From Swiss-Prot, chain A:
<comment type="function">
    <text>Component of the Mediator complex, a coactivator involved in the regulated transcription of nearly all RNA polymerase II-dependent genes. Mediator functions as a bridge to convey information from gene-specific regulatory proteins to the basal RNA polymerase II transcription machinery. Mediator is recruited to promoters by direct interactions with regulatory proteins and serves as a scaffold for the assembly of a functional pre-initiation complex with RNA polymerase II and the general transcription factors.</text>
</comment>
<comment type="similarity">
    <text>Belongs to the Mediator complex subunit 23 family.</text>
</comment>
<protein>
    <recommendedName>
        <fullName>Mediator of RNA polymerase II transcription subunit 23</fullName>
    </recommendedName>
</protein>
<comment type="subunit">
    <text>Component of the Mediator complex, which is composed of MED1, MED4, MED6, MED7, MED8, MED9, MED10, MED11, MED12, MED13, MED13L, MED14, MED15, MED16, MED17, MED18, MED19, MED20, MED21, MED22, MED23, MED24, MED25, MED26, MED27, MED29, MED30, MED31, CCNC, CDK8 and CDC2L6/CDK11. The MED12, MED13, CCNC and CDK8 subunits form a distinct module termed the CDK8 module. Mediator containing the CDK8 module is less active than Mediator lacking this module in supporting transcriptional activation.</text>
</comment>
UniProtKB/Swiss-Prot annotation, chain B:
<comment type="similarity">
    <text>Belongs to the Mediator complex subunit 24 family.</text>
</comment>
<comment type="subunit">
    <text>Component of the Mediator complex, which is composed of MED1, MED4, MED6, MED7, MED8, MED9, MED10, MED11, MED12, MED13, MED13L, MED14, MED15, MED16, MED17, MED18, MED19, MED20, MED21, MED22, MED23, MED24, MED25, MED26, MED27, MED29, MED30, MED31, CCNC, CDK8 and CDC2L6/CDK11. The MED12, MED13, CCNC and CDK8 subunits form a distinct module termed the CDK8 module. Mediator containing the CDK8 module is less active than Mediator lacking this module in supporting transcriptional activation.</text>
</comment>
<protein>
    <recommendedName>
        <fullName>Mediator of RNA polymerase II transcription subunit 24</fullName>
    </recommendedName>
</protein>
<feature type="short sequence motif" description="LXXLL motif 5">
    <location>
        <begin position="46"/>
        <end position="50"/>
    </location>
</feature>
<comment type="function">
    <text>Component of the Mediator complex, a coactivator involved in the regulated transcription of nearly all RNA polymerase II-dependent genes. Mediator functions as a bridge to convey information from gene-specific regulatory proteins to the basal RNA polymerase II transcription machinery. Mediator is recruited to promoters by direct interactions with regulatory proteins and serves as a scaffold for the assembly of a functional preinitiation complex with RNA polymerase II and the general transcription factors. Required for basal and activator-dependent transcription.</text>
</comment>
UniProtKB/Swiss-Prot annotation, chain C:
<comment type="function">
    <text>Component of the Mediator complex, a coactivator involved in the regulated transcription of nearly all RNA polymerase II-dependent genes. Mediator functions as a bridge to convey information from gene-specific regulatory proteins to the basal RNA polymerase II transcription machinery. Mediator is recruited to promoters by direct interactions with regulatory proteins and serves as a scaffold for the assembly of a functional preinitiation complex with RNA polymerase II and the general transcription factors. Required for cholesterol-dependent gene regulation.</text>
</comment>
<protein>
    <recommendedName>
        <fullName>Mediator of RNA polymerase II transcription subunit 15</fullName>
    </recommendedName>
</protein>
<comment type="similarity">
    <text>Belongs to the Mediator complex subunit 15 family.</text>
</comment>
<comment type="subunit">
    <text>Component of the Mediator complex, which is composed of MED1, MED4, MED6, MED7, MED8, MED9, MED10, MED11, MED12, MED13, MED13L, MED14, MED15, MED16, MED17, MED18, MED19, MED20, MED21, MED22, MED23, MED24, MED25, MED26, MED27, MED29, MED30, MED31, CCNC, CDK8 and CDC2L6/CDK11. The MED12, MED13, CCNC and CDK8 subunits form a distinct module termed the CDK8 module. Mediator containing the CDK8 module is less active than Mediator lacking this module in supporting transcriptional activation.</text>
</comment>
């Protein structure tokens, strides 16, 4: 079952072929082909035991981080955002499966920045009180970075600080920020710098 | 050792209001010895705080911002050519030192040394704390009734350092038009970018 | 077949290494008689200093050397000391119509990735009708390159798309 979706997405996403770079007279994919593949996968996983949507999204987010392909990654992120827009892939599930085991700080820094920019495109992450594990994992992925990384990757990694700033600022009107205080216990044991 | 132990005691707070009150009373307790204590403290600790490796571990705290605020306050206060003759310090301050490197003066030279260290702290490819520290220091230095940023018409690095920091909007407008010289054209162009 | 010496040298685990000397060196020095078998003099302090301390990732330098005179890259206010190491401004000066230069900020020059940055997409491409068509086909073509390379591959793809959508 999962291999069927795997092959379908591989035929959809990895539709590129080494084709004699010399120019042919032949001459959108990011607007029509992406939507067609999204709708096909939508019908599939809607008729493919949606109970396993967690494992499906895990497979998808794993495959996304496989291609180095900075520009191709950004296109897949827009595809995933549009698939969120159609009422599919609830935000809590997709972000909880995207943050863990896939952010990979310093492994794919460009993918880190693009992932957190996608999360910022869904910065609201409109859901129930289940934003707790998201914030906890974000703080964990932030703290697993020492204080002497570099001075060339600062803004590329600052997407984490941007997301946290949006969360805390909107917490005046988005969610009970006392829940954020009780969720950030991991960083402050009554004050530890 | 006085200022060193005071800073060591200050860098153990881990609370915003604590650090704010701490620096607010430190600026006062430094009185009656403004020039000498200011010069010594700045030109000794701030380099040692920004040049070592264990010193970086202590400045990553929010106390860092309060320390930068205290430093710029002492600098701006000591720049004023007031008497400040204490009762028992007017005599015990009869010493000699070339300071081991406008005009040639101890405070005048100590400020230039600090500005040069600031510009070198924008030395990229490795920094986590002491880029954040200088960013907080410049933001605190952004204030009215400012007499720092010495600004001689010839070659002074402070505006080159300002352009470098801008590379790293009203902050550029701070040292925008100081001498009204073609030097201001440089920062103007860099702000236009 | 004569595995005796092999098994004995394998059995000789202990740290003390003087039995082999006293056992073999006499015979060799008797038969072979070199007072200085290696009379060359060797006194070496090998490493004095090896660093230019001004080099950006050399792999990128190779590509900037291999570039055609039509292309020309530079550096903007640079968050590119050693890690990003690039976000350039490449103007495709050529015979055909010019365009707007992209950023193309690439990863470490080992290149388990590609460049594409797409920063000035917002105002530059929407403003013009021709520039709007330039972006269209060029995105689809860049979504085809398998593991594109920073300077040569991406720059040539950009130029080809710019002069192909020109029609």
């Amino acid at each position: 079952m999962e291999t069927q979706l795997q092959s379908i997405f591989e035929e959809v996403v990895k539709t590129e072929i080494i084709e004699e770079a010399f120019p042919g007279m032949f001459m959108e994919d990011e607007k029509t082909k992406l939507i067609s593949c999204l709708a096909a996968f939508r019908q599939f996983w809607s008729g493919l035991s949606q109970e396993s949507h967690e494992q499906c999204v895990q497979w998808i987010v794993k495959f996304i981080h496989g291609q180095h392909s900075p520009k191709r990654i950004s296109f897949l992120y827009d595809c995933l955002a549009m698939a969120v827009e159609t009422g599919l892939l609830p935000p809590r599930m997709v972000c909880e499966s995207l943050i863990n085991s896939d952010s990979l700080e310093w492994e794919r820094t460009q993918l880190w920045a693009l992932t957190f920019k996608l999360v910022r495109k869904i910065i609201g992450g409109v859901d129930y009180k289940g934003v707790r594990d998201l914030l906890k994992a974000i703080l964990e992925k932030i703290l697993t970075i020492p204080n002497t990384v570099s001075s060339a990757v600062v803004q590329q990694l600052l997407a984490a600080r941007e997301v946290i700033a949006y969360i805390l600022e909107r917490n005046a009107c988005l969610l009970p920020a006392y829940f954020a205080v009780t969720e950030i216990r991991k960083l402050y044991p009554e004050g530890k710098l | 050792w006085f200022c060193n132990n005071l800073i060591k005691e200050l860098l153990k707070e881990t609370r915003k209001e604590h650090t704010l009150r701490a620096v607010q009373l430190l600026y006062s307790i430094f009185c009656l010895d403004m020039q000498q204590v200011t010069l010594v403290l700045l030109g000794h600790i701030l380099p040692g705080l920004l040049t070592d490796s264990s010193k970086w571990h202590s400045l990553m705290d929010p106390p860092g911002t309060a320390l930068a605020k205290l430093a710029v306050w002492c600098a701006l206060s000591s720049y004023s050519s007031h008497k400040g003759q204490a009762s028992s310090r007017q005599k015990k301050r009869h010493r000699e030192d070339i300071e081991d490197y406008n005009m040639r003066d101890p405070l005048n030279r100590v400020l230039a040394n600090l500005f040069l260290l600031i510009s070198s702290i924008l030395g990229s490819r490795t920094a986590g704390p002491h880029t954040q520290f200088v960013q907080w220091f410049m933001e605190e230095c952004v204030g009215c009734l400012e007499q720092d940023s010495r600004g001689s018409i010839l070659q002074f690095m402070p505006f080159t350092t300002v352009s470098e920091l801008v590379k790293v909007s009203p902050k550029v407008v701070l040292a925008i038009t100081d001498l009204s010289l073609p030097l201001g054209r440089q920062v103007a162009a860099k702000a236009i970018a | 077949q004569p595995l005796l010496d092999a098994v004995l040298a394998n059995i000789r685990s202990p740290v003390f290494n003087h039995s082999l000397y006293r056992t073999f060196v006499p015979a060799m020095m008797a038969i072979h008689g070199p007072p200085i078998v290696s009379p060359v003099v060797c006194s070496r302090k090998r490493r004095f200093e090896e660093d230019e301390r001004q080099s950006i990732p050399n792999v990128l330098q190779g590509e900037v050397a291999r570039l055609d005179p039509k292309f020309l890259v530079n550096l903007d206010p640079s968050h590119c000391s050693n890690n990003g190491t690039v976000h350039l401004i490449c103007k495709l000066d050529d015979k055909d119509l010019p365009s707007v230069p992209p950023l193309e900020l690439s990863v470490p020059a080992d290149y388990p990735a590609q460049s594409p940055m797409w920063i000035d997409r917002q105002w530059q491409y929407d403003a013009n009708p021709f520039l709007q068509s330039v972006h269209r086909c060029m995105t689809s073509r860049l979504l085809q390159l398998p593991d594109k390379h920073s300077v040569t591959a991406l720059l040539n793809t950009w130029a080809q798309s710019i002069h192909q959508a020109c029609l």
